Design a protein around this ligand. Structure first.
Ligand code: HEM
Ligand code: HEM
Ligand code: NA
Ligand code: NA
Lengths: 713, 713
């Protein structure tokens, strides 16, 4: 069946903005997961999970009689797809149960793990999501095996179709670097936004880079990919050694015995995959990764035996029974228990990537410290597991249930509690009149509030206007934010604030975060008045101001917009065309195509462009809120051509005289070119549409201003 | 960007059920197009279209000073994609303006035609849809040139994204038959559901079959494709000769001068395509099809000169300036005017497919009658043009505006007017109790109402329970409908009806169409009661009973379900897997994936399978409305394998004992296999889901019963 994708494989794809419709969702449109979860008996679920750990099923028997290691791995894979570049991936939507992640080679036999959880999921129904259950199961596994966790938050709502994520361009699973779709170039530079070394892996190749078993070069890939998942050296060593305290790998015979991944298997397999023709196909004969390593002498119990073994032996390169590279301890006795046969024991073994923790010099110092001070290892792993499994959940206001840790962590981008009366509607009217009387323009007011709010991304629920981080490093210096113009606006708003706060009784005060957003609303109201329309823009107070010490500058760098079509901004030249980058940004802001359309047309005429560029400013009444962008864009009296100097800039000329009327970028003109976008632009550029344009614009403006407002839920 | 479709190209695609979401729609969710249209000043729009006809734009000058021919072709191609096999295609959703149709080769330069209409669309805004405007413009063209049309109905709501239609498997535009994706097999048998001879054509190749200029062989393709668009011989001849009374073709120079179609063109082209490097690229130099034919001596005036020329000359095979085969009149004078140069004249010319009208012997008799009696030609054409342009609009209740023809046509599947009081809620409860006391079972009641209602297809809005056509030929004999069981049910319901109607005063009566649906409602209520649940299933009366004389039996043949997964029914063996056919049926019924899932699980346990097959009947309490289908399907204690006899039938056996518990088809087991469907099945198979299952089942049942109820809007 030939599709539009087949004929025009480079046309823009708008269907990523219309996912997650009420159509695909089986729950009612009033379903609120937070409310269902807050009534769950969480203690009862944990008891059932504890029982499950040692209730072996014959279709996938438990190693050592205990499923703990399998479930820790299941939870670390759920969380492990996270990339800090876009916030996409992670455990927070339960995507491991959908394509493609359900079928990634690195997720082999996690299908079995999820199926073992079906009875519990069934018993508790809508009150616990799959997404929450995968993480909670990991926690229970750790607890069952003697490790005390740092805590747990519920609230990850289930999703019902696959997320649109760019996982890479390779067309072969586990393709090694340098191919026609290589994710690597230069001196082993991994392309943004990717955070894994091969297609279908979580972070790195356990045999070493491109399969070459050198622990030192593996360490370099470990460091780069874990940093791209927001983890530093200490967290990385704690997580890897912590995880590999438990369980085992599975490589009992050749990989060619393993059949189709779940999305390719027959219908009779009922959602499972990787069926194996090697001996019994499971248990003692299991094949998952192809490696055959068991790390400690008590694989079902928390121990300090990982680092005793790593440092206490010298290591020899060898091969598993499937042919994979792995390491065995020189001269050791057979001290490692067998998973099924009490009369067998095995020598200690390690992956190349485990040896990285000893042979990379910076890791070695951390690993030695953890070896000599196991209580520090325990605490570091507990904190890192919490971070790993919660890093994509967003502000602490979304954390549900009775095990949420009280300690505030820097990586949560924390926002102080509000402890004072908030401004009311009379106060807001007074503050808007003050903002307008100060001389700040529409363009300055709109641009500043857009800059503050538009850092939000729905993928990990980071960013937005709450916190007033626009005033702090590094946001205040981002080129897209226009740092000199920004400084002058914030200085005037800070004087307004100081004067209003100084006059109040009781404890009433306004935060700068609220005033930035309020001043943007006044801008939009003034712009509507310039056009002859009487419009009130909704505002909700309650934002608070975070400090510089609560704002990790390195972690904040990934929110920098290097492309923001809403301000017609591009920081450099990229391989991806600018209109694909606009749709990507709309997706992170949670906008539909009609919302993206309205929003961009309105921003153009209000003067939100970076550096006051005229590109896309198709109006003779700038700073007035009108539908001019659409009416002028669609005027067939104008002809467009790319410029000689720059192919990404276009001149719009009167068709009859040749006279220049406008210029635009690709972000501008795509609205008059892409056949779906142009259909939307036509609605807003019609003669009956001016009031609809204004109303829709105010709605989407308000939506963006509130994206991070999880305190108002 | 590698996608799920790239890795698993044969997995089922559920996204076709979730198009047309409120997310992608720029109009508000209360927008009602019918209400906007009913206030349009249609006379004022027609006056503007009339002025447009002779107002040439320089970017695409009008042939002969008149855009009429161009707009008739635009309106004929908008309607000409219709296929009777599935009802997909046609003019009713304005799909010509989206991909792929906007870029089909046969639609070359219609982009210019649509752009000419933008100023009128802009003026009238939401009160006239693009869909309606395309057709209206064609009508006004005809009127302006002296032809009396049969009428016009508004009401085609605009759509906002491409519809998912199977247009063929070819990967090359206009690929000749016999390739690796051939749409032809056997003795030139075109595969259902296609209705064109090549990918990107409307019906046929104007040069002749696979480019061979034989009028006789071309006639066979004309007849076959037009029949597949619901047009007989008379209507076919009227349409082709009627259309080719006007205007001209465009082939002034070689085709290699013509650039990229609209979806492939550069962004600067602003949605237009086929830019030509041949001389001025337009007007006198235009290239569209590559043919260069002008049929009549007054191309901008209705005449009977097409048939005067077709019969008054002998014809010689020749070539256009682009190299296409075409025909020229032997020994004729230069009598045909030139489109731009008043001092030039040309000889009469024809397409191969024009000459089909004279050299096929059945066409020749009709064409001679139309030649001798041009008043008959005019009436046939008017009726055919109406049918062509309205055939996908659905029941007459959807027709809006002041020009709707009052004559009721057989192809409209007409429903008589209701002229008596309707039954009220107390009457409906009395009739339900009488149906249940007759002895009819849950299974008989649900199966009969499902059979009557499930013929609906949202592609052309044909079928549904209104009319009670299930009691007439040919429905009453369709194998899926279980003809002997159906006849017994209808006999009992007809006695109930006769008794209730005989006892009334004051005109009140119940139609059999309403009683069939009410009886199905009683069945569902009883099934809920058998499970321990009291529900009321909504019912809306107002259907009427059509007669056999108002039912075209041949036209009804395309509504026969040959695959109906909801009844576990497959009439024969097909190339396409049965699960793909289930999703295709759900799309025709307008169901989402959650609605399809609920509905199928419920139908299984209510006994709706054809022939009382136990396949998929995963319950020990058949005829009770429970979620047993889902609970049992998802039980990991059962193992499934295909049978030896039949690979499309599966046995479900206890995993521990080997005991046979169930059997199912691919349609049953897909719900436990496909990762998105299994996620939906899990929600309904949870321990907390019984009330949700019942409520959602009742909702989707009611939706299906009401699909054709455009009288209630
Ligand atoms: C450099 C990063 C890492 C690499 C290359 C990696 C590699 C692997 C591989 C190849 C397996 C074997 C799969 C099989 O054949 O069954 C595995 C098992 C496992 N990993 Fe990791 N690992 C990494 C980090 C982690 C982390 C961060 C955790 C958890 C905090 C984790 C916990 C586990 C556990 C518990 C198992 C045992 C599974 C079982 O008992 O079935 N690993 N690892
Ligand atoms: C066997 C069926 C048909 C074939 C093969 C056919 C073929 C074509 C071709 C190849 C063109 C020239 C495109 C160009 O170069 O500009 C054309 C023009 C046209 N056709 Fe058809 N046609 C068919 C049926 C119809 C019908 C059913 C109608 C309307 C009732 C229609 C109305 C027209 C008109 C009005 C034009 C003139 C366009 C203009 O003036 O720009 N045709 N036809
Ligand atoms: Na994410
Ligand atoms: Na249709």
């Amino acid at each position: 069946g030939t599709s539009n994708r087949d004929w025009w494989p480079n046309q823009l794809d708008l269907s990523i903005l219309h996912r997650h419709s009420s159509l695909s969702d089986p729950m009612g449109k009033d379903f609120n997961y937070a409310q269902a979860f807050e009534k769950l008996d969480l203690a009862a679920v944990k008891r059932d999970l504890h029982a499950l750990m040692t209730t072996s099923q014959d279709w996938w028997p438990a190693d050592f009689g205990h499923y703990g290691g399998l479930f820790i791995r299941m939870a670390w894979h759920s969380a492990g797809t996270y990339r800090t570049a876009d916030g996409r991936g992670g455990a927070g939507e339960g995507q491991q149960r959908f394509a493609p992640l359900n079928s990634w080679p690195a997720n082999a036999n996690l299908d079995k793990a999820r199926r073992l959880l079906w009875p519990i999921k069934q018993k508790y129904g809508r009150a616990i999501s799959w997404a929450d259950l995968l993480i909670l199961t990991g926690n229970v596994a750790l607890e069952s095996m003697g490790f005390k966790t740092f805590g747990f938050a519920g609230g990850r709502a289930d999703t019902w179709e696959p997320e649109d994520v760019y996982w890479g361009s390779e067309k072969i699973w586990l393709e090694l670097s340098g191919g026609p779709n290589s994710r690597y170039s230069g001196d082993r530079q991994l392309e943004n936004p990717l955070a894994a070394v091969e297609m279908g892996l979580i972070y790195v190749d356990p045999e070493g880079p491109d399969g070459n078993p050198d622990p030192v070069a593996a360490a370099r890939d470990i460091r780069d990919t874990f940093a791209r998942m927001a983890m530093n050296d200490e967290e990385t060593v704690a997580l890897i050694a912590g995880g590999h305290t438990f369980g085992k790998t599975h490589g009992a015979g050749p990989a060619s015995n393993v059949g189709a991944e779940p999305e390719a298997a027959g219908i009779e397999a009922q959602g499972l995959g990787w069926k194996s023709a090697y001996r019994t196909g499971k248990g003692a004969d299991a094949i998952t990764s192809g490696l055959e390593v068991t790390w400690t002498t008590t694989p079902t119990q928390w121990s300090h035996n990982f680092f005793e073994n790593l440092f206490g032996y010298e290591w020899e390169l060898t091969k598993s029974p499937a042919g994979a590279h792995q390491w065995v301890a020189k001269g050791a006795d057979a001290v490692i228990p067998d998973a099924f046969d009490p009369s067998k024991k095995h020598r200690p073994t390690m992956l190349t990537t485990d040896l990285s923790l000893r042979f990379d010099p910076a890791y070695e110092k951390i690993s030695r410290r953890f070896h000599e001070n196991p209580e520090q290892f325990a605490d570091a792993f507990a904190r890192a597991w919490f971070k790993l499994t919660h890093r994509d959940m967003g502000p602490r206001a979304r954390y549900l249930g009775p095990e949420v840790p009280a300690e505030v962590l820097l990586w949560q981008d924390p926002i102080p509690a509000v402890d004072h009366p908030l401004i009311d509607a009379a106060d807001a009217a007074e503050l808007k009149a003050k903002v307008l009387a100060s001389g700040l323009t529409v363009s300055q007011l709109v641009s500043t509030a857009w800059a503050a709010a538009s850092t939000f991304r729905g993928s990990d629920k980071r960013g937005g206007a709450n916190g007033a981080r626009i005033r702090l490093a590094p946001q205040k210096d981002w080129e897209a934010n226009q740092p000199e113009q920004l400084a002058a606006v914030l200085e005037t708003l800070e004087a307004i604030r100081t004067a209003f706060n100084g006059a109040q009784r009781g404890g009433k005060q306004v935060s700068l975060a609220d005033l930035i957003v309020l001043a943007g609303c006044a801008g939009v109201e003034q712009a509507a008045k310039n056009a002859g329309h009487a419009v009130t823009v909704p505002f909700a107070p309650g934002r608070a101001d975070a400090s510089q010490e609560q704002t990790d500058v390195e972690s904040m760098a990934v929110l920098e917009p290097v492309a923001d079509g809403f301000r017609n901004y591009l920081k450099g030249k990229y391989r991806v065309p600018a209109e694909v980058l606009l749709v990507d940004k709309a997706q992170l802001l949670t906008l539909s195509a009609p919302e993206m359309t309205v929003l961009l047309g309105g921003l153009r005429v209000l003067g939100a462009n970076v550096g006051q560029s005229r590109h896309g400013v198709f109006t003779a009444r700038e700073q007035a809120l009108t539908n001019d962008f659409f009416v002028n864009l669609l005027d067939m009296g104008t002809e467009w051509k790319p410029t000689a100097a720059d192919a990404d800039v276009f001149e719009g000329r009167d068709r009859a005289t040749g006279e220049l009327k406008w210029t635009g970028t690709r972000v501008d003109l795509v609205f008059g070119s892409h056949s779906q976008l142009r259909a939307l632009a036509e609605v807003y550029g019609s003669a009956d549409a001016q009031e609809k344009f204004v109303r829709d614009f105010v709605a989407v403006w308000n939506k963006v201003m509130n994206l991070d407002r999880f305190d108002l839920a």
